[PDB]
Design a protein around this ligand. Structure first.
Ligand SMILES: CCCCCCCCCC(=O)N(CCO)C[C@@H](O)[C@@H](O)[C@@H](O)[C@@H](O)CO
Ligand SMILES: CCCCCCCCCC(=O)N(CCO)C[C@@H](O)[C@@H](O)[C@@H](O)[C@@H](O)CO
Ligand SMILES: CCCCCCCCCC(=O)N(CCO)C[C@@H](O)[C@@H](O)[C@@H](O)[C@@H](O)CO
Ligand SMILES: CCCCCCCCCC(=O)N(CCO)C[C@@H](O)[C@@H](O)[C@@H](O)[C@@H](O)CO
Ligand code: NA
Ligand code: NA
Ligand code: NA
Ligand code: NA
Ligand code: NA
Ligand code: NA
Lengths: 92, 90, 92, 90
C-alpha cells in the first residue's frame, strides 16, 4: 500500500512539473507555478470541470493537450482506486 | 482482462463513428470528426458536463439524443469499472 | 441481481412521479413531465450539476428540496454501486 | 459498519462547524450557517463544482482554503467508499 502511495506522489509531482512548463504562460491561473499545478491536477484527477472547465480552454491553445491529461486521468484515477481498495483489503 | 479492454475499444470506436454522423453538423465543436467525438465520449464517460454541458444542448436539436448517451453511459461506465476491478483481482 | 435492478426501477419511477408533482410547475424544463423527470434524476444520480445546476436553483424556490434529493442520491448511488458489484461477483 | 457511519457523522459535523466559522462571512450563501455548510460539504464530498464552483472562488479570498477541503475530500470520499463496501460485505 505504501509503494502505491509513493508511486502516486512521484507521478503527481512529475506531472505538475510537466504541466507548469507546458501551460503556465498561456494559462497562469491554472498552471502558473508547481502549487497552482498540483491543485489543478488534483481537481482534474477528481474529474471536476476536467474538460469544459480545464482541457477544452487549454486544447484551444495547445491542440494536443489531451495527450497529457487523458493518460494522466487514466493512470491517477486507476491508482487512487487501487490504493483505496488496497487499504480496505489490508484491514480485514 | 484483455478481452474486456478490447470490447471497450470496439464499442468506443463504433459509438464515436455513430456520434460523428448523428450530431456532427449540428454540434461540430463536439462531434465534428472521429477525433472530436472520441474526446467527447471520453468526457461523457468520465461524466463531466454530460447533461448540462453536452446532452441538454444536443437534445434541444435532437429530442431523443438520450437513447444513445444514457445506454452509452450505462455500458462504458460499467465496463471501465469491470476492467479496473479486473486488473486489481489479476 | 434481478431483485436489485427491479428495486432501482420502482424507486426511479416513484421518485420521478414525486419530482414531477413537486417541482414541475416552478421548474418545467427539468421536471415538467415524467420523461423530463427520469432524465433529470438519472443526471442527478450520475451527479452532474446536481447542486449548482439543479438543487441550488430548486432550493431557491423550495427551501427543503434537499430532503428529497440528498436521500435519493444516498439510496440510488448506493444501489447502482451494489448492482454493478453484484454483476461482477455473479460472473467469477 | 456502524462505527464507520458514526465516524463520518462526527467528522461531517466538526467540518461543517469549522467551515461555518472560516468562510461564513465572506461566502454566506455557501457557509452562512451549519445547515448551508453541511449541504455544501455534502456537495463538495460528491465532488460537484468542488473547485471551479466552490474552492477556487473561496481560495480567491482565503489563499490556503485547500488545506481544509483537499484533506476533507481525501477523508470523506475514502470513508464513504469504505462504508458502502462494508454494507455490501456484511
Ligand atoms: C494529491 C495532493 C494534492 C496537493 C494539493 C496542494 C495544493 C497547493 C495549492 C497552493 O498552495 N496554492 C494554490 C494556488 O492557486 C497557493 C496559495 O495557497 C498561496 O500560498
Ligand atoms: C478511451 C480512449 C480515449 C481517446 C481520446 C482521443 C482524443 C482525440 C483528440 C484529438 O485527436 N483531437 C482533439 C479534438 O478536440 C484532434 C486535434 O488534437 C487535432 O489537432
Ligand atoms: C435509469 C433509466 C433512465 C431513463 C431515462 C429516460 C429519459 C427520457 C427523456 C425523454 O424521453 N425526453 C426528454 C425530455 O427532456 C423527451 C423527449 O425525447 C421528447 O420525446
Ligand atoms: C451527509 C449528511 C448530509 C446532510 C445535508 C443537510 C442539508 C441541510 C440543508 C438545510 O437544512 N438548509 C439548506 C441550506 O442551503 C436550510 C433551509 O432548508 C432552511 O429553510
Ligand atoms: Na462522477
Ligand atoms: Na463533474
Ligand atoms: Na463529477
Ligand atoms: Na460539474
Ligand atoms: Na465524480
Ligand atoms: Na460533477
Amino acid at each position: 500500500v505504501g509503494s502505491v502511495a509513493a508511486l502516486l506522489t512521484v507521478v503527481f509531482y512529475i506531472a505538475a512539473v510537466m504541466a507548469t512548463n507546458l501551460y503556465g504562460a498561456t494559462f497562469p491561473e491554472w498552471f502558473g507555478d508547481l502549487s497552482k499545478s498540483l491543485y489543478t491536477l488534483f481537481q482534474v484527477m477528481t474529474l471536476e470541470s476536467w474538460s469544459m472547465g480545464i482541457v477544452r480552454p487549454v486544447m484551444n491553445v495547445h491542440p494536443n493537450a489531451w495527450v497529457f491529461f487523458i493518460p494522466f486521468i487514466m493512470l491517477t484515477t486507476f491508482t487512487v482506486l487501487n490504493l483505496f481498495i488496497g487499504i480496505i483489503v489490508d484491514a480485514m
